[PDB]
Amino acid sequence: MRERIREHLSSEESVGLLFSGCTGINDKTLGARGGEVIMVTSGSGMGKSTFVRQQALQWGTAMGKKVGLAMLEESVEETAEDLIGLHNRVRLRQSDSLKREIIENGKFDQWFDELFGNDTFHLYDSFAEAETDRLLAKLAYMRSGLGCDVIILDHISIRKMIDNLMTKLKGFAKSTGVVLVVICHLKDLRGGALRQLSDTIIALERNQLVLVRILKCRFTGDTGIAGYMEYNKETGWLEPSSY
Amino acid sequence: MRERIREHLSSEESVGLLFSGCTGINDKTLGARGGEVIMVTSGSGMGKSTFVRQQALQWGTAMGKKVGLAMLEESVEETAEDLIGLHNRVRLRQSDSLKREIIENGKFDQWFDELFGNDTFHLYDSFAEAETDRLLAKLAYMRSGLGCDVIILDHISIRKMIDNLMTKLKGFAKSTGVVLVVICHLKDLRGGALRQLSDTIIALERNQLVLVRILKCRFTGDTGIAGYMEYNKETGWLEPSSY
Amino acid sequence: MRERIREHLSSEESVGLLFSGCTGINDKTLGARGGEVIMVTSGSGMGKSTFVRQQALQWGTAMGKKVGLAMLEESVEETAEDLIGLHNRVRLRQSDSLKREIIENGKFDQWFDELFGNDTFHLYDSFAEAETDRLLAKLAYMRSGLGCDVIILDHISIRKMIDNLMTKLKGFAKSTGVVLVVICHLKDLRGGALRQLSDTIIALERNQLVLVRILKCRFTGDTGIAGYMEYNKETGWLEPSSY
Amino acid sequence: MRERIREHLSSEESVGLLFSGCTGINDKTLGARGGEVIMVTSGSGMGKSTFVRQQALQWGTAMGKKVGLAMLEESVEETAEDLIGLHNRVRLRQSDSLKREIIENGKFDQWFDELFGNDTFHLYDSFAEAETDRLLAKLAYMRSGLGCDVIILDHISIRKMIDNLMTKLKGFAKSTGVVLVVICHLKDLRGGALRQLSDTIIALERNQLVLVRILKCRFTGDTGIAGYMEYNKETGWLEPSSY
Amino acid sequence: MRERIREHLSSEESVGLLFSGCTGINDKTLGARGGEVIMVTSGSGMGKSTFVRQQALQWGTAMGKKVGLAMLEESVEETAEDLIGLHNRVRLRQSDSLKREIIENGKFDQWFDELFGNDTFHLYDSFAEAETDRLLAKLAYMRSGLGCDVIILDHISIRKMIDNLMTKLKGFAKSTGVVLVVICHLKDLRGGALRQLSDTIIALERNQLVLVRILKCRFTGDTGIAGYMEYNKETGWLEPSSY
Amino acid sequence: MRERIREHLSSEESVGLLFSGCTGINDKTLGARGGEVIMVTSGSGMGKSTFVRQQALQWGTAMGKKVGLAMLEESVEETAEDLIGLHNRVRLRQSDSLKREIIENGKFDQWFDELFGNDTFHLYDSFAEAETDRLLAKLAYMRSGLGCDVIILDHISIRKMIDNLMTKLKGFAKSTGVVLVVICHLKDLRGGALRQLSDTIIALERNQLVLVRILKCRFTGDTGIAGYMEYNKETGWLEPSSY
Ligand SMILES: Cc1cn([C@H]2C[C@H](O)[C@@H](COP(=O)(O)OP(=O)(O)O)O2)c(=O)[nH]c1=O
Numbered sequence A, B, C, D, E, F: 001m002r003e004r005i006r007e008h009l010s011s012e013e014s015v016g017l018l019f020s021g022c023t024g025i026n027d028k029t030l031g032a033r034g035g036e037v038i039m040v041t042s043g044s045g046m047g048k049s050t051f052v053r054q055q056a057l058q059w060g061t062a063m064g065k066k067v068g069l070a071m072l073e074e075s076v077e078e079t080a081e082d083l084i085g086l087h088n089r090v091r092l093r094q095s096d097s098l099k100r101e102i103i104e105n106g107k108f109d110q111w112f113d114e115l116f117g118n119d120t121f122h123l124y125d126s127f128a129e130a131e132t133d134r135l136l137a138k139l140a141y142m143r144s145g146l147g148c149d150v151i152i153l154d155h156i157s158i159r160k161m162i163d164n165l166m167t168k169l170k171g172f173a174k175s176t177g178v179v180l181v182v183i184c185h186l187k188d189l190r191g192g193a194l195r196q197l198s199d200t201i202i203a204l205e206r207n208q209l210v211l212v213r214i215l216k217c218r219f220t221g222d223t224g225i226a227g228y229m230e231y232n233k234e235t236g237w238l239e240p241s242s243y
């Protein structure tokens, strides 16, 4: 047992992929570990995608990880436009001028390669269909075929479709070891499987500055509010706050 | 994807119909885009109609757009009287003298043609009935038949009648691409569907000078108070303020 | 629509019964129109009755209108005594001498006929009972039977009794077209239905010379203080001031 | 109505019990009428009791009225001593000599009969208990049993004890028709029920010669300062001034 | 009542302990009565202690009364030194020579006995602590145990410490019947409880000869300036003036 | 108490350091005692420094006391030059000749030793900084370290800097027992703490011969003008006058 414990001790990975932007989030969760399903939820328009996108950007950019992004609602172009702006600290969607200036400027193309030029980001859309298996097959391919380290499912709103999907999702993450982040719309109880299968659930709250609350973290058990973030309307990035 | 993003970038219309009178409203909303439902709400008598009417006047007059106006509460004559006065910077309803002077003067007729002479404004009343479909059928006709660019529904007060109507309205706007502005009476929470389906919600506040608050804007997400306006009791126009 | 607007324009009555004594009140309200409910409120003993009474005197006397007065609190004699004094610019209630002198003098009788001799004023009391319908039935009779142009309800203090009554009152005024003035005791918010149903609300303020404030006027929307009046302790008439 | 108004006119009592000592007090109040509650208030030691006492003396002495005096704070002897001195224009409480001289002189007894010998004054003390009903029962007896025309409650300082008492007091005065004068200690707003129920409120002010201010008079409405009085330190009587 | 008034008349003590040195002080106050709290106030160094001390000297010396003196600020020796000098019309504190001469002369001892030899004066110090009850306990002992007729508290400067103390002091004086004189430092309004609880307030004023003003006297009500006194820099006694 | 008073009597020091030059100053103040703060004030250039300097010279020279001098405005050399001249009855600052003659003459050096040769005078400058504590620390050192009997602070002009300083100064003097003389510039009321904390305040007045007025002396209380002095323009010494 002694030797059995030792190697067990020196082989266990407690700290996963560290999050970014919110001072305190890593304290209460120790980052994202493989095989775990992170659930990021809150009200519509409260900044879920942005936050996840930001995490994705840093993971694939700085942590040198491969990130696949599967969008159920919006298209790839839309997603691509968001990441590029984000990466370039500008909000392409808000400036008809910038969009026009950047294309003839040659900056678009320069921006496109400096981001997707490598094999780091894998965006997939067209899952508009409500079939789980068709979805799981694509996810499984993104992991095995594209070697994605992190897969973000965007998005799901609160039957068995969700119950069964959440159980299939958690099964996929646990068995492969990929980090699966899922974005769910909330219109703890505010979400069965949704709460049960998810390993860590993060929720963002706003004015009614965003409050990041850790509703649940199996591994650490440390719950509560991890900290606050401030959205920069000019850059579109969520920044750590001094609240 | 590259070419897919590019054309997506150069084909997206971020700035819609710009609003008028309030310095700052366009900053936080980037105007009104087609397929979106703008909700203008506040207390009764707080200036909702005026504001919308003003927007309508400029849109159909300066922006060269076709504006249909569907009134649930008041008659066409009443509406027509308001626009004409507005257009002529006078308050017909307040001056028994002016009304009388303008008819024998020949200015009424001159005013009537210089405004409705063209096929730009389409006023429809007699929706007094509480049936949605009868209403949707007329709206759909104003868009398709009369080619209206903007449709203002005046008005609605806070069941399914509203819930279902709001969902039918948003469905009509999204699918056709028309800009639908709806005026609702409030006697964010102050309004389900009302808040959910509406893309942008503007609220006016007064003394208890009008404060224009942007309760919600999906596209931009930029919320808060856009600015202030000053009502000119002599002209009836809401003017930009220096508060 | 053109012809439809025209006649609408030449048939609309913007200026109602003009008020008297306060230079500016008509400016911000354009007088009292039929079908509207005017609410005159303020602290007890602040001069509500006097003001209304004065308006009533001029309306029935100079404007050649029929005025019915329904008193909930005081008796007809009391009211009659007030009008007569008012009409004769003397305060009968304050002079035991004058009352005695005028009866044997023959001036009482001369005063009584020169005021009530005609079918212009209709005073009704004995509504001490808290039943609305009994009240509405009498009001409706004063309008239809006695052909009263203006009906003053004196008075009401701030449930449904008031809520339902105010809604019944406004319904009676709108449908018949009579001008209903109601006096309410206040011990804008200082008053639901009270504020909602009333078309114009006038409030008098004093020393803690009377300030006439127009809390609300649907038709005109022009709010604020209309002007000041000075009470003549010798005549009992409120006079226009030079404040 | 005519005959109804007439007799109403010739049966109404406008002028009540006239006050004494202050030229002008009767002008602004027309004296004290039955069924009304007069409130006399001011700072402690400012001369409230004296003033009331003086009124009481004249009422019961010259106006041939019966005056009951109920003291909450001080004893009957004390009150009796004050009235006697007052009646005899001397300050018994200030002269150890006079008190001694008057008893052996036989003047005390002569003074006692010439004042209380008749059934005009009724002094009651021992209400030290804070119970209202016990108090109302005694008051009611002073009116009905002793036939008191005027009842002076001395005194009360500023809950429901006061709120409920004031409402019980006003109810007692209105229903019986007695004139109830109440003395309250003030340490218009300076006093709910206190201001509301009281028909006339008189306040005395001094040096920081006494100024008599009429804070409120329902019947007349005439407010303001009625005049000034000068306290005679030798006689203890408040005299009319020439300020 | 008659017999009740009589004995009341012949048992009442209007004139208390007469003051000394200022012709007129007794006129406006009739001396100090038991159960009353006399407040002597003015600017620091204006002669408060001296005046009180002088009163104390005469009371215990000529009026044959027992006087207890409780000092909060200074020591007994200091007080004793003042009284002795005062009693001997010399200022011990000002003459290093006299102090030295009197001790070897044997006059000190002769002076000490001729003043404190009897059980007339009771000086207590060491109240430096800010606790009221500890103070009240000593005062109560000076009254009951030492049978002091007059107690002088020296001194207090202007919370609840003062508010509560003043209310405890007045309660002690009223219930026991002792005359409590309190010296307060002023750096009528110049002083709540201080003004309220005190029965008589005397103030001294100087050059910016001392003016003695009677700010308040419940019993007599006679206020104003009682007269003037002249300080004898050689004897230390305040003398009556001819101003 | 007897023995307690006696020793108190024979241990008290009434007469402090006697002043010089003005016949009468000691009469009204009995000199300067330890623990007291003497304030010498008047208009700029009216002779404050001279007077104090003179006192300092005599104290340290004839009374055999140690005098520390702390200058806020001028330098040590300047001060030293003044004392030396003063000591030698000549005005060094006025004679370019004398200054030159005395240095080569050897009289400077002889003068310097015959004055500062001993450890009697301690001059400190360089307090130009507006910090109190830095100042108090030096003062405390002059007392404890240098054993100064008298400390002259020169100078201060009329917040908390002065308020707090005066309270710190008085606290330092009372607790140590040193005599602290402070010179303040006046551009009784002419000066809170300044007047309050100071034990004795002396003021000099001139022609618009110097008049010495004792504005205040706690210990003695004797106020008024102590006498007059005549400035000798040739020696620089203020001399007693025969006015
Ligand atoms: C957090 C946040 C978002 N937003 C905007 C950006 C987007 O246009 C819009 C939606 O944000 P999004 O991240 O899509 O929210 P969610 O995923 O919860 O639906 O809101 C702001 O304008 N300000 C903010 O502070």
Ligand SMILES: Cc1cn([C@H]2C[C@H](O)[C@@H](COP(=O)(O)OP(=O)(O)O)O2)c(=O)[nH]c1=O
Pocket: B042, B043, B044, B045, B046, B047, B048, B049, B050, B051, B209, B210, B230, B231, B232, B233, C218, C219, C220, C221, C222, C223
């Ligand atoms: C904003 C505003 C409105 N109004 C008047 C104009 C109209 O007669 C009346 C109603 O305005 P309206 O635009 O109808 O208000 P809403 O649509 O919120 O019910 O108020 C003013 O008089 N002053 C003002 O500043």
Ligand SMILES: Cc1cn([C@H]2C[C@H](O)[C@@H](COP(=O)(O)OP(=O)(O)O)O2)c(=O)[nH]c1=O
Pocket: C042, C043, C044, C045, C046, C047, C048, C049, C050, C051, C209, C210, C230, C231, C232, C233, D218, D219, D220, D221, D222, D223
């Ligand atoms: C306005 C006013 C009223 N009054 C008097 C007249 C009446 O006797 C009494 C009540 O006035 P009233 O009109 O009855 O007041 P309201 O209707 O608000 O209760 O006040 C004055 O004496 N002076 C004034 O300036």
Ligand SMILES: Cc1cn([C@H]2C[C@H](O)[C@@H](COP(=O)(O)OP(=O)(O)O)O2)c(=O)[nH]c1=O
Pocket: D042, D043, D044, D045, D046, D047, D048, D049, D050, D051, D209, D210, D230, D231, D232, D233, E218, E219, E220, E221, E222, E223
């Ligand atoms: C008005 C007045 C009262 N007083 C005295 C008489 C009484 O002893 C004392 C209290 O008067 P009082 O009438 O009791 O005052 P209140 O009822 O307001 O408490 O004051 C004067 O000495 N001078 C005056 O001018």
Ligand SMILES: Cc1cn([C@H]2C[C@H](O)[C@@H](COP(=O)(O)OP(=O)(O)O)O2)c(=O)[nH]c1=O
Pocket: E042, E043, E044, E045, E046, E047, E048, E049, E050, E051, E209, E210, E230, E231, E232, E233, F218, F219, F220, F221, F222, F223
């Ligand atoms: C009244 C007076 C006091 N004094 C002195 C005597 C004391 O030493 C000092 C303080 O007097 P004191 O009685 O202590 O004043 P208070 O009690 O108001 O503080 O003042 C005079 O020198 N002259 C005077 O005319």
Ligand SMILES: Cc1cn([C@H]2C[C@H](O)[C@@H](COP(=O)(O)OP(=O)(O)O)O2)c(=O)[nH]c1=O
Pocket: F042, F043, F044, F045, F046, F047, F048, F049, F050, F051, F209, F210, F230, F231, F232, F233
């Ligand atoms: C009193 C006095 C001063 N002085 C001069 C001496 C110095 O040069 C100057 C300033 O005196 P100083 O003592 O410094 O005055 P203060 O301290 O009040 O500012 O005035 C005279 O010339 N004649 C005089 O009579």
